[PDB]
Structure formats: C-alpha cells, structure tokens
Amino acid sequence: AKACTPLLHDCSHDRHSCCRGDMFKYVCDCFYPEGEDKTEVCSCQQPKSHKIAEKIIDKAKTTL
C-alpha cells in the first residue's frame, strides 16, 4: 500500500490512482469478458498520446 499502479496493473478500484507520466497521467482501461454486471476486468494502460509518442521516438531512433 505504498507503491503506485503503473502500466499493466490492477486499477479497477481506481482509474485516477495509476502513476503519473512525463506528459500526462496513465489511463485505466476496462473490459467486460462476458461479465459486465458480474466482474469487470480493468488494467493500467497508456493514452493515445503516450503510445503515439513512444512509437515515433523509437521509430526515429531506429531510423537514425
């Protein structure tokens, strides 16, 4: 109960609990695998901004 909820972690209990990012805060994704009113599975993920950013960075780096 000291650390935070980084990428690939349980955030179903809190979507705004995930760790902060360099540009923005991570995003908590949710899914209902045949159980929307039973048990929703959520996990910490990165926003479209962070994703795209990394992609470009990595691409250029490997391109240079």
Swiss-Prot record:
Q: Where is it localised?
A: Secreted
For this entry, the protein name equals: Purotoxin-2
- Other remarks on record? Negative results: does not affect mouse P2RX2 or P2RX2/P2RX3 purinoceptors. The toxin (and its derivatives composed of N-terminal or C-terminal domains) are inactive against a number of bacterial strains.
> Where Leucine amide occurs along the chain?
L64
Report the protein's function.
Answer: Enhances the high-affinity desensitization of human P2RX3 purinoceptors. At 50 nM, the toxin decreases the IC(50) for ambient ATP from 2.67 nM to 0.77 nM in human P2RX3.
PTM summary from the entry reads:
Amidation at Leu-64 is not mandatory for activity on P2RX3.
Give the domain section of the comments. The toxin is composed of 2 domains: a highly rigid N-terminal inhibitor cystine knot (knottin) domain and a rather flexible C-terminal linear cationic cytotoxin domain that forms amphiphilic alpha-helices.
Q: In which tissues is it expressed?
A: Expressed by the venom gland.
- UniProtKB keywords: Amidation, Calcium channel impairing toxin, Disulfide bond, Ion channel impairing toxin, Knottin, Neurotoxin, Secreted, Toxin
At the top level, the lineage of the source is Eukaryota
Give the record's GO CC terms: extracellular region
Span list, region Knottin domain: 1-44
Residue ranges, annotated region (Linear cationic cytotoxin domain):
45-64
Q: Which PROSITE patterns match?
A: SPIDER_CSTX
Q: Which InterPro entries match?
A: Spider_toxin_CSTX_knottin, Spider_toxin_CSTX_Knottin_CS
GO terms assigned for molecular function: calcium channel inhibitor activity; toxin activity
